[PDB]
RNA sequence: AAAAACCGUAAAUCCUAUCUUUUAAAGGAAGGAGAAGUCGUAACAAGGUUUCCGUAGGUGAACCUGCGGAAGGAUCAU
RNA sequence: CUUUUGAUGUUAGGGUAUUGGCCUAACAUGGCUAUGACGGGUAACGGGGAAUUAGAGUUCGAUUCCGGAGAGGGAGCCUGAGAAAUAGCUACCACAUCUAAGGAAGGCAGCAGGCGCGUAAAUUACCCAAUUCUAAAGAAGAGAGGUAGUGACAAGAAAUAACAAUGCAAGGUUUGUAUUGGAAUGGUGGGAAUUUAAAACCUUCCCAGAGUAACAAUUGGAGGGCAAGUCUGGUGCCAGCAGCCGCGGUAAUUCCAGCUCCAAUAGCGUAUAUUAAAAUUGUUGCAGUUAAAACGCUCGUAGUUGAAU
């Protein structure tokens, strides 16, 4: 006799949005990106 | 189950004094069936 | 009913899927070979397995065993015609030994960037995909293709390419040039 | 595929301490009772 | 040609019997799970009567006792 | 177990296209069985094959081909070279259609399609052009078959950029990286060649046709197993998460969110089943004093194994 509290904390959770960012670069790029940024820059 | 029985490391109920209860449950059952049919 | 058209897998996936220094070594060979995701390194290893498989079982047999020198020689002229085999092999031990990147060598964009044209792996890649270049009076746009050892000295730009004596440039640009050259004089 | 009898809340094992929300449902195969859990945080409320 | 009879092939229905599967049920008796419930202290220390086995009887319960075994004993030993 | 009611065999016959207990008459008492008969179960059509496989193995095979069987369930029959035929007939049972009530007519487990059942499966499309069959055999038909439609069942290839300059970082004037700014190219729209039975698709050619290339990639996670945050808010044994171990009672690396990161990627989760993992079914190849497991003991038939020459 307590389910008058199913979706208390997704209830109470403050809202936020999402914002906008860049576009998310995907494919072989992605993977370029990652590559370079693992073998290049580090020294 | 098998010829483990007792072997109290669990610190149970003693497997002869088990053994004794169940016999006379069957028992008890036995004559149950017999009365019935 | 059913038709009878054959078809099959070409990359097994690889298990344990998270073991770091597989993922780190993977990410070296697309990195470097500009390929375009892990499935194409695992249809590598796959293919590579089939030719080890086959090798490995002719290994087993004894010489002058006649599936020997039939199956085998089919083997090592293959190899030899695809190129991962130069002429110093002889024996199927040298085929045991091949290895990623010795068959990532022949990819065409691999091939292309090696022979100039596109300055990059990437850039060669996205020109074969805007099928900028040809094999020798074939133009193919599947930057997998691999090359054998009688067609890396006819690889160069497709003929109906912009860059192989086609249509030159941006013809929106080109209009706008010659209209503003029209309209100023 | 079934239908709800009824929501029902069931208690968590003794270390834990939580009241999950599950759903009793009557099979259309065979009409036999069952209790399937409802996943998700505030799904119970979002079945009838 | 209808029609009929007789052997034969023989659907189908009914009776009876058996078997298989499912299922109701007063009452009875288990097992498992839950909670801080009640009563005791059985086992683990020589667990405060060493423990256990088979068997038999008894008791609110764990259990107790008799007979014969075992050490997995608390003894590898005048 | 079988054997009155054919079970096993003999003799004679009947019947068949032919042999035969296939059936009849007489006679005999045989026939099978722990090397599993006779029964029961199968969510069992068999095989060619499929998945997984180091080698063994384990599981699957309704389903392209072959063989078998069936046309709601049984039985019977005509024609015919060939049928116990079912888009042939006859009857019964169960369904079910029209009827003027007297009577007629039915069989989608063929192709579409509908209902129902369900977790679970497409268009009441086009054509005989290809393959091939039937005919009185170019020329007619063929829901055989082919074509298209629906189709993230599976399978293959493969976009979501690339490049040059400064500014920044790293290095002795080489790499990565926010600005600019021109090329390349598909997706898409249109016309055409072509293809096609017709059409569509592919391919090819010509016009348009990318800068936030808005022509924007998602799914699942970030304590361990297991790659990736003790970052920030909310909740505070509640809500919830969690395959397992576990997290949650005010610093939650695990819940609910934002950011970031990780993995796979036009694919990614979930459920169930199955295979490997499993040398946890062990012939290869397990274990049995104490973890599960040497029969209380001996004899003993079947079985298994057996000195040398």
Known sequence: ?43 | HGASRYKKSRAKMRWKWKKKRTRRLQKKRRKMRQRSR | ?185 | ?48
């Open chain 3, 1 to 185: 009913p059913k038709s009878y058209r054959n078809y099959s897998k070409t990359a097994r996936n690889p298990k344990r899927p998270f073991e770091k220094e597989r993922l780190d070594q993977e990410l070296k060979l697309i990195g470097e070979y500009g390929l375009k995701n892990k499935r194409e390194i695992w249809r590598v290893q796959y293919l590579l397995a089939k030719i080890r498989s086959a090798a490995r079982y002719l290994l087993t047999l004894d010489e002058k065993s006649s599936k020997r020198i039939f199956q085998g020689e089919a083997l090592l002229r293959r190899m030899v015609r695809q190129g991962l085999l130069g002429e110093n092999e002889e024996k199927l031990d040298y085929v045991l030994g091949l290895t990623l990147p010795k068959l990532l060598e022949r990819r065409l964009q691999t091939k292309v960037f090696k022979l100039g044209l596109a300055k990059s792996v990437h850039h060669a890649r996205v020109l074969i995909r805007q099928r900028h270049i040809r094999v020798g009076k074939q133009m193919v746009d599947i930057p997998s293709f691999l090359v054998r050892v009688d067609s890396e000295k006819h690889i160069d730009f497709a003929t109906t390419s912009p860059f192989g004596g086609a249509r030159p440039g941006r013809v929106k640009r080109k209009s706008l040039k010659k209209q503003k050259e029209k309209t100023e004089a």
């Open chain 1, 1 to 43: 006799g307590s389910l008058a509290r199913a979706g208390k904390v997704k209830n109470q959770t403050p809202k936020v949005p999402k914002l906008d960012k860049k576009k998310r670069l995907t494919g072989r790029a992605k993977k370029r990106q990652l590559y370079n940024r693992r073998f290049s820059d580090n020294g």
């Open chain 4, 1 to 48: 595929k079934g239908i709800v009898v009824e929501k029902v809340a069931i208690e968590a094992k003794q270390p834990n301490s939580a009241y999950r929300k599950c759903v009793r449902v009557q099979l259309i195969k065979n009409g036999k009772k069952i209790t399937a859990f409802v996943p998700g945080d505030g799904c119970l409320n979002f079945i009838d």
